[PDB]
Amino acid sequence: SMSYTWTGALITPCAAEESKLPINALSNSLLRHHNMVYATTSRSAGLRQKKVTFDRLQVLDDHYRDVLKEMKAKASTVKAKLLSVEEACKLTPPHSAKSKFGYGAKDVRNLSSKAVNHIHSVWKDLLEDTVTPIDTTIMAKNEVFCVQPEKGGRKPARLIVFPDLGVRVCEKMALYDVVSTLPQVVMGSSYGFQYSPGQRVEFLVNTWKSKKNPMGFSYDTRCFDSTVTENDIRVEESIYQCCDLAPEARQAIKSLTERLYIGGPLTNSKGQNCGYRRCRASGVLTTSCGNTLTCYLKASAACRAAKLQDCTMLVNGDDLVVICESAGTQEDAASLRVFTEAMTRYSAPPGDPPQPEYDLELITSCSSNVSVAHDASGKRVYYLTRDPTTPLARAAWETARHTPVNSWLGNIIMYAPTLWARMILMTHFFSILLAQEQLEKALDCQIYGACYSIEPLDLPQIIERLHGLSAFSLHSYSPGEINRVASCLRKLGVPPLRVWRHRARSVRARLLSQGGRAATCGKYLFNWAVK
Amino acid sequence: SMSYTWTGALITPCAAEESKLPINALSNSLLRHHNMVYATTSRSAGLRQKKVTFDRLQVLDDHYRDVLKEMKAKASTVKAKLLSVEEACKLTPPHSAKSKFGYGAKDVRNLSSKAVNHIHSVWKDLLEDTVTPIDTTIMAKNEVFCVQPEKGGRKPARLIVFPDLGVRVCEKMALYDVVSTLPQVVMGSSYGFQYSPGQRVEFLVNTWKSKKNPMGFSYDTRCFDSTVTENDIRVEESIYQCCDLAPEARQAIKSLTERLYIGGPLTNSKGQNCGYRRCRASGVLTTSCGNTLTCYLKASAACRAAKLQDCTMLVNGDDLVVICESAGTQEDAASLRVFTEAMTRYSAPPGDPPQPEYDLELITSCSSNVSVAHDASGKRVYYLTRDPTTPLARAAWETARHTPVNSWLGNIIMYAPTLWARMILMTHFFSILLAQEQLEKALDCQIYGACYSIEPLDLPQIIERLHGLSAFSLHSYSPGEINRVASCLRKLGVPPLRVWRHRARSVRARLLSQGGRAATCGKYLFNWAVK
Ligand SMILES: CCC[C@H](CC(=O)O)N1C(=O)c2c(C)nc3ccccc3c2C1=O
Ligand SMILES: CCC[C@H](CC(=O)O)N1C(=O)c2c(C)nc3ccccc3c2C1=O
Ligand SMILES: CCC[C@H](CC(=O)O)N1C(=O)c2c(C)nc3ccccc3c2C1=O
Ligand SMILES: CCC[C@H](CC(=O)O)N1C(=O)c2c(C)nc3ccccc3c2C1=O
């Protein structure tokens, strides 16, 4: 079936949309060539629709069936509970989209009688009606990127499809305890979301070093959510039902599967019908867990189809990396083509063909890669980095505007050991905090979980806990990493590293002069700048 | 050992304390004899200390050992997870006492870097140190009562003993998923906290009707928290460890048991050492679960000791009711004395001797009892009520002052079908909301779980969900119930029911005239008043 059917009504916005980088004193100081940075809007939605809309063919084989049996066996050892309305409310994110039924996320979290009575009514209805498709909203995402002048400049907006807030809370009642424990048990060390950046590095490096002649590749599925079939979503449901669950959870999980997860009608922000979905909804509770299980299942089967030797997989939703024993150059090339044909048969055809890699540094998984540097004693230290283009573009945007989502601080935390986060992001933002006397003021931050209220002065302690103390003394980065940062600085028109080291030497100076916790920041975050 | 040892430092307050009922237009309209209503303060703490301080002797027998084996067998089927720091933070109550380490409950719930970093540090310390007693604070509670002129007028303040906010969050990480699932599995239908008021009534009534000649009794332990021994708290720990838990949870549960739950030093609000505890702390996560398991264990053993026939127990923390088959009047009297001697040997000696009862209405459990009335069709409807004295006294207090804890609204919800909640509390408070134009304004409310933000206009829908529609049409209440309400109105100087019906007829009139949701309130909440 077609992943989507459309009526012709437009995907519409709910507010003014900016496509152009606010141009400037502070932001220009970071990034000069401002026309390379753009944001997506509803205007490009029409073209994303084209991309994500296609027929799916799916032919399963016994490799798939065997793997699914194994997964169900592990699932059968899992016990999970229903969350009460009140638990599900307290676990609702603070900025999540309001209900059309007259309450918002703050009401949910504060256990408002209105939200609570409503959610209670949605839950009854899930149990008593296992049929009627549940409404969803479709919207174009507003995200910031750099032009990719040579994979068209601007990409169109990605789409998000979500049910009403009331339903989202009921999803947690039925499934929060399942999605938060089940993939771990089924997939073990292949379950990517159990790892901090450092633990991800440890797994990848140990996996890589364990092969005599390692080969690895990332596998990029073309529009993964769109490739997920009805059968895939029912298979997911059958894995959930292998768990030892409460009677009401089983009923609600079945009902959510039938009425919401398999598909349903799509409504724009103006209330008209945009069309119909028969693939993964991007904005449900089970998006991540479901994509993970489904990717793992298809990929494990395809590894067997391709007869790849001593395969180790790491899966984060639609994001897949495999590391195996090389059979030789041409052998690997052939086996990866066979892997890809199996994935394609399972309804997960690729964006660009996967390529075998023989250098761990060149494998990008979750937009990141392992690199190496050395600490103060001279020992090799592996760490997670990424291409700094999107982080820098977004940091420039956030220098122009206020935001709950100032990604710059999340990037500083998650990528604290990197050359670019240390020399550029820390320097740039601490310069601004100092000048504006906002060093002590808490800022909202989306980490790859909740929303945190982070005091900048807590950064040394956060980084120490997450990265360890070597984060404050890494030196002698790889030539590939340095190259990539250098080319990105040129591309975007960021001042060279000379100009950052330098500027940081002055930032370190305010900080140390301020004494106290500000001096601790100068001391640990900027020890690289002095000597 | 002694339940407590004291140094002589005083239990001190953290703010001005009122003992006397604010005297008045609105509150006087509800309750005239204002000197009968008082609140407890730190000044009476010295005398509570005397009461809760005693040596415990405990001699276990094979009835106890057999029951414990059975409980452990059931516990062994339970699986439970660690909560992340972030989950435990989101489940922290909004008004919980701030940390001495520079953050409050709002910081915890908003995932502040300061709270988060701190809690992370407390958790490490729990895992790495299983020895050093953890500090606790002791405070006198401020609670409102009526004078009991014939069980001395005023009781002294109850005491609460709690660790720091950081530790309380770690308690949830280790044990939230255990305390929220384990007692249910071990104790089944005897676990009182699984029931709404109505489901509690259903269990009690069906249990009572299932005996040929029913007898029941409540058992009131003298200062239950004080009777809980070191061995009791280690037995609790051994039941927790029967669960299939994560390695870190096991370690933290052991460590919390050693450093906190078994005992430790007591510190007043001024920071000095008040003494040392060797019994149950009243303000830990495991207080309710622990008291429930321990009460159930001791009581089940004592039932066997006393050879009570076809026993059914209902347990809510320290609160215990048993319903069994009568062996005859003098036989029952003797068996209850033997039950009491067994409980006493197990270190749970009684306040007043338990008395056998042959009328379900006269058994008070959790300050409440089952009664009967009839609905609009004339069918018998069982419901939960209680002596209205404390609810009325507290409602009068809350008419004098603002409060997050306006118990009046919680009492209206939980006791919506009662004669007194309907005629007096609903009438009184809706009269005030109407006059002050605050009908649409949300109010904070502690139900016997979280803190709710309740819009008064949602009451009809809340009551319907919890009680059913018969709540709005109960008639022909029991003569015992009517008697008790009548005597309480005389005692406290509340206007007679004539004066309430009457006044409600006018309240119903504003409401219906207002139209909309206010009219729905007039229609359902006050249908008793018109006809
Ligand atoms: C110069 C016009 C830029 C605007 C800004 C925006 O994104 O809203 N812009 C479009 O109007 C637009 C359309 C209609 N389709 C696109 C398809 C792919 C990529 C970009 C598109 C843009 C676009 O950038
Ligand atoms: C995080 C930056 C500290 C290190 C350590 C060092 O001083 O060697 N550091 C670099 O790695 C580095 C590089 C690769 N290029 C630079 C160019 C100009 C000025 C400083 C540079 C630094 C640098 O300080
Ligand atoms: C008339 C004085 C009433 C005060 C008010 C209060 O409770 O703080 N009051 C006491 O001072 C007091 C003391 C010292 N001990 C008590 C012991 C038992 C019950 C009441 C006590 C009160 C008391 O009410
Ligand atoms: C919740 C009150 C409604 C009922 C129903 C009825 O009208 O019979 N109701 C009483 O039960 C009741 C009693 C016991 N005493 C009263 C005394 C004076 C006025 C009304 C009374 C009511 C009453 O309305």
Swiss-Prot record, chains A, B:
UniProt superkingdom: Viruses
Membrane topology: Single-pass type IV membrane protein
Gene source species: Hepatitis C virus genotype 1b (isolate BK)
Role: RNA-dependent RNA polymerase that performs primer-template recognition and RNA synthesis during viral replication. Initiates RNA transcription/replication at a flavin adenine dinucleotide (FAD), resulting in a 5'- FAD cap on viral RNAs. In this way, recognition of viral 5' RNA by host pattern recognition receptors can be bypassed, thereby evading activation of antiviral pathways.
Regulation: Activity is up-regulated by PRK2/PKN2-mediated phosphorylation.
Impact after mutating T286V: Almost complete loss of RdRp activity
Subunit annotation: Homooligomer. Interacts with non-structural protein 5A. Interacts with host VAPB. Interacts with host PRK2/PKN2. Interacts with host HNRNPA1 and SEPT6; these interactions facilitate the viral replication. Part of the replication complex composed of NS2, NS3, NS4A, NS4B, NS5A and the RNA-directed RNA polymerase embedded in an ER-derived membranous web.
Record-given protein name: RNA-directed RNA polymerase
Cofactor(s) required, per the database record: Mg(2+)
